[PDB]
Amino acid sequence: MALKLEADRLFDVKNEDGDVIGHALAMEGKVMKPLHVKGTIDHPVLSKLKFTKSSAYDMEFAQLPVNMRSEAFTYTSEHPEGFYNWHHGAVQYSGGRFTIPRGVGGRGDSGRPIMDNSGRVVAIVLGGADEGTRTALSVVTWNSKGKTIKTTPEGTEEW
């Protein structure tokens, strides 16, 4: 039945020698990536754009080229408790926190989006704090009025 054919929305950010140290994404008309991730966007067009910084939220962004604006994720500010999806599997959202099993997130996971079954982005991963058998994520989300919010658990380590 299904072939996972999708637009080019998620991009790699590499370090000086070329290791993937994070991710950048096309969403709501912008290319955004965590500010703490110091590398270059592995894309001939995106890497030449002028990026605006937002230290208060660990975000760095630029406007999408007119063309690419269609190849992009849609965000949603509604996240009822339950399970969500990301590159490594299930992400649980309960208690105001997004958690994953311990020993799963780390370098390379910054900038990865957490999604719902309808394919909308619900949050962007920044780092994590292990608490017991789980890891609580430091994520960026936006509220219903479009305000950016940043939740960082105690002892979070940036990925």
UniProtKB/Swiss-Prot annotation:
Residues 1-9 are annotated as: Ribosome-binding. Residues 9-159 form the Peptidase S3 domain. It is found in: Virion; Host cytoplasm; Host cell membrane; Host nucleus. Changing residue 42 to H/Y: No loss of autocatalytic cleavage by capsid protein. No infectious virus is produced. Residues 80-90, 116-120 are annotated as: Dimerization of the capsid protein. Changing residue 36 to A/P: Complete loss of autocatalytic cleavage by capsid protein. A motif (Nuclear export signal) lies at residues 41-51. The active site is at residues 36, 58, 110. Changing residue 58 to N: No loss of autocatalytic cleavage by capsid protein. Infectious virus is produced. Residues 52-57, 144-148 are annotated as: Interaction with spike glycoprotein E2. The record marks 84, 117 as: Involved in dimerization of the capsid protein. The very N-terminus also plays a role in the particle assembly process. The N-terminus also contains a nuclear localization signal and a supra nuclear export signal (supraNES), which is an unusually strong NES that mediates host CRM1 binding in the absence of RanGTP and thus can bind CRM1, not only in the nucleus, but also in the cytoplasm. The C-terminus functions as a protease during translation to cleave itself from the translating structural polyprotein. Forms an icosahedral capsid with a T=4 symmetry composed of 240 copies of the capsid protein surrounded by a lipid membrane through which penetrate 80 spikes composed of trimers of E1-E2 heterodimers. The capsid protein binds to the viral RNA genome at a site adjacent to a ribosome binding site for viral genome translation following genome release. Possesses a protease activity that results in its autocatalytic cleavage from the nascent structural protein. Homomultimer. Interacts with host karyopherin KPNA4; this interaction allows the nuclear import of the viral capsid protein. Interacts with spike glycoprotein E2. Interacts with host IRAK1; the interaction leads to inhibition of IRAK1-dependent signaling. This is Capsid protein. It comes from Sindbis virus (SINV).
